């Protein structure tokens, strides 16, 4: 029941009750999470998104981003509202027509307008590799081995009151889970395995906010992929996974036939597992249909530590092996005050004209681009370093860059940089007070690429900038279809702009 790589995708409003509490939602494909969009490496995806939304309480406009797909030459298809497009208006559709050369792994898709993805528009996106170098490590890799972790709110995203703390009401694993308060014994998700087989579990955080401590009682997990990047095998018994990150891990069904708890503990909201919150069930074929009776350890033996991960391929680190050893070394001042985030003193507020359209219309330095102070130019064919020192309230903040993955030269909670063999990924926790998480990449993808915290509430409150990569070559690199050119006039007419 995967769809794609050529598919329609309808975006609708409907009631759902994933934790036993009914609320309206914004759904792709009629479900929460949305259906898996899938294809093979190098395929042409043609996702015709039909905006059928009618309930203004969750916004009737929409725009969808394909998280972690580089969009080289198709920046117009990337999805962030007012960065690469105007939103699609209700009653209209738009074909996101792009290719995925050179990428294979676990991705996801989500609304990229306001906080709308929190209201339900989120689903997995898998690019399989027919020649996967990890293929011999497992037996099963299909829709039944995708594990999504989601935060779910009873209050609608647009209706979260100004000045009150926002926390979720349930953790949903594969779309099901129990509410933290007024808990009812609603159905839990079941992941089924066969004794003796090995599974490529594709763990996807579709969170709007919390990080999760993910584990499976009785089992360990051998990581083989990080945010689309193949890794050396790393065996862990717990994974702290931040918003928008992905891991593949091998699960060996090597425990007695039975039922085992799957645990996903968020860093906010309900703590523990009373009443079966924060839980799903791993069930072996032939086990009794009953809840697990297993317990977690008090202390995990082998938690994931990001510096333990290393690429499977020889990826190295671009630039020179010291701080500032790049063509364009940056240090961002990431701050929060009075309800707003800022980057180098500027809080992001989406512009009226999308950044890409401003560039195509001839704005040719980043000082000319709106929002003023929110768009930073990057030079072409250059090594970029971005230090992201933590400290701003609401952390740990998982920062994400569109259009690129990056070497994680320095990780959370460890002052030592790695210029030899760090993991590459696309979303990274910047850690805690005093940390200096630092990323590097090379600029080989002209266009405006969003850089932001992936806690959606923080993005909405301004925690973002746009890297206008290679402004001079953006128009030649990214020819735009007529339907894209039609988006802003249609949107602005509908909204009387
Ligand atoms: C904090 O982060 C640093 C940097 O990522 C980590 O340092 C790295 O630690 C590894 C593991 O010990 C070192 O690699 C090892 O190298 C030795 C040669 O001495 C080799 O025999 C081992 O097989 C292994 O590959 C690596 O050199 C080192 N890198 C740097 C730049 O120091 C460190 O482990 C992290 N701290 C914690 C507590 O995890
Ligand atoms: C994080 O690392 C960056 C460099 O990647 C540090 O930046 C330097 O900051 C000092 C002032 O604090 C400046 O004088 C230098 O010009 C900067 N660049 C260098 C040395 O390459 C930054 O200080 C670090 N931040 C934290 C909090 O550790
Ligand atoms: Cu994303
Ligand atoms: Cu993205
Ligand atoms: Cu944040
Ligand atoms: Cu984004
Ligand atoms: F992305």
Residue nearest ligand 2's atom 13 by CA: 331
Residue in 307, 317, 322, 409 to alter for ligand 1 test, most ligand atoms within 8 A of Cβ: 307
Q: What's the gap between Cα 117 and its chain centre?
A: 11
125 phi, psi to nearest 5 deg: -140, 110
Query: Which one of the listed residues 98, 216, 277, 402 is annotated catalytic?
Result: 402
Active site residue 471: no
CATH of 1-133, one of 3.30.450.30, 3.40.50.300, 2.50.20.10, 2.60.40.420: 2.60.40.420
User: Where on the phi/psi map is residue 39: left (φ > 0), alpha (ψ -120 to 50), or beta?
Assistant: beta
Q: Does the C-beta of 324 come closer than 6 Å to ligand 2? A: yes
Q: What's the gap between Cα 165 and its chain centre?
A: 23
Active site residue 10: no
Quote the ligand 5 centre to 165 CA distance (angstroms): 14
Active site residue 495: no
Question: Under DSSP, is residue 402 helix (H, G, I), strand (E, B) or coil?
Answer: coil
Quote the ligand 4 centre to 475 CA distance (angstroms): 21
Q: Does the C-beta of 358 come closer than 6 Å to ligand 2? A: no
Examine residue 488 and say whether the peptide bond preceding it is cis (omega within 30 degrees of 0). no
Number of other residues whose CB lies within 10 A of the CB of residue 224: 23
Q: Decide: 76 and 84 in contact? Cβ < 8 Å.
A: yes
Question: Where does the chain hold its CATH 2.60.40.420 domain(s)?
Answer: 1-133, 134-313, 314-497
Active site residue 219: no
Interatomic CA distance for residues 6 and 39, integer angstroms: 9
Residue nearest ligand 1's atom 28 by CA: 418
Interatomic CA distance for residues 309 and 306, integer angstroms: 6
Q: Please report which ligand is nearest the Cα atom of 417.
A: 1
User: Where in 41-188 does DSSP place strands (E)?
Assistant: 44-51, 64-67, 93-99, 105-111, 122-128, 146-152, 170-173
b/e burial code for range 125-147 (CB count within 10 A of at least 16 → b)? bbbbeeebebeebbeebeeebbb
CATH code, 134-313: 2.60.40.420
Query: Which one of the listed residues 277, 341, 384, 400 is annotated catalytic?
Result: 400
**What determination technique applies here?**
X-ray
CATH of 314-497, one of 2.60.40.420, 1.10.940.10, 3.40.50.1370, 2.60.120.10: 2.60.40.420
Q: Does the C-beta of 387 come closer than 6 Å to ligand 2? A: yes
* Beta partners for residue 223, in sequence order: 234, 249
Q: Does the C-beta of 323 come closer than 6 Å to ligand 2? A: yes
Q: What is the resolution of the experimental data for this entry, in Å? A: 0.9
Binding-site sequence positions: 65, 67, 110, 112, 397, 400, 402, 452-454, 458
Interatomic CA distance for residues 402 and 426, integer angstroms: 8
Quote the ligand 2 centre to 297 CA distance (angstroms): 40
* Residue/partner pairs of 300-304 with CB below 8 Å, 24 or more apart: 300/215, 300/237, 300/238, 301/237, 302/220, 302/235, 302/236, 302/237, 302/238, 303/236, 303/237, 303/238, 303/239, 303/240, 304/223, 304/234, 304/236, 304/238, 304/239, 304/240
Q: Does the C-beta of 154 come closer than 6 Å to ligand 2? A: no
Quote the ligand 6 centre to 444 CA distance (angstroms): 19
């Amino acid at each position: 029941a995967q769809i794609g790589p050529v598919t329609d995708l309808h975006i609708t409003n409907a009631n759902i009750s994933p934790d036993g509490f009914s609320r309206p939602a914004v759904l792709a494909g009629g479900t929460f999470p949305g259906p898996t969009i899938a294809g093979n490496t190098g395929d042409n995806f043609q996702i015709t998104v039909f905006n059928d939304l009618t309930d203004p309480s969750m916004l009737t406009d929409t725009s969808i981003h394909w998280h972690g797909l580089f969009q080289k030459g198709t920046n117009w298809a990337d999805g962030p509202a007012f960065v690469t497009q105007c939103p699609i208006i209700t009653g209209q559709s738009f074909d996101y027509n792009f290719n995925v050369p050179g990428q294979a792994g676990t991705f996801w898709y989500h609304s990229h307008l306001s906080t709308q993805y929190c209201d339900g528009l989120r689903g997995p996106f898998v690019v399989y590799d027919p020649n996967d170098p990890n293929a011999s490590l497992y037996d099963v890799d299909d829709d039944t081995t995708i594990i999504t972790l989601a935060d779910w709110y009873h209050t609608l995203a647009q209706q979260e009151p100004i000045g009150a703390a926002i926390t979720a009401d349930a953790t949903l694993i594969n779309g099901l889970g129990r509410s933290f308060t007024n808990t009812t014994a609603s159905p839990l998700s079941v992941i089924t395995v066969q004794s003796g087989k090995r599974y490529r579990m594709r763990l996807v955080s579709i969170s709007c906010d919390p990080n999760y401590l993910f584990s499976i009682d009785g089992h360990d997990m051998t990581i083989i992929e990080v945010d689309g990047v193949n890794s050396q095998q790393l065996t862990v018994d717990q994974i702290q996974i931040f918003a928008a990150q992905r891991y593949s891990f091998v699960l060996n069904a090597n425990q007695p036939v039975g039922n085992y708890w799957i645990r996903a503990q968020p860093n906010s909201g309900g703590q523990g597992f009373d009443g079966g919150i924060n839980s799903a069930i791993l069930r072996y074929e032939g086990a009794t249909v009953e809840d697990p009776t297993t317990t977690a350890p008090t202390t995990f033996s082998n938690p994931l530590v990001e510096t333990d991960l290393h690429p499977l391929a020889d990826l190295g680190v671009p630039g020179q092996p010291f701080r500032g050893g790049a063509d364009d070394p940056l240090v961002l001042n990431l701050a929060f005050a009075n309800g707003r985030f800022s980057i180098d003193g500027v809080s992001f507020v989406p512009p009226t004209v999308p950044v890409l359209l401003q560039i195509l219309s001839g704005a040719q330095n980043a000082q000319d681009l709106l929002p003023a102070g929110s768009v930073i130019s990057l030079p072409s064919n250059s090594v970029i370093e971005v230090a992201l020192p933590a400290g701003a309230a609401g952390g740990p903040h998982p920062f994400h860059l569109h259009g690129h993955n990056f070497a994680v030269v320095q990780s959370a909670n460890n002052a030592t940089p790695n210029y030899v063999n760090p993991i590459w990924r696309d979303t990274v926790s910047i850690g805690g007070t005093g940390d200096n998480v630092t990323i590097r990449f090379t600029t080989n993808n002209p266009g405006p690429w969003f850089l932001h915290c992936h806690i959606d509430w923080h993005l909405e409150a301004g925690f973002a900038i746009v890297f206008a990569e290679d402004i001079p070559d953006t128009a030649s690199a990214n020819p735009v279809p007529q339907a894209w050119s039609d988006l802003c006039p249609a949107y602005d007419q509908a909204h009387n702009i």
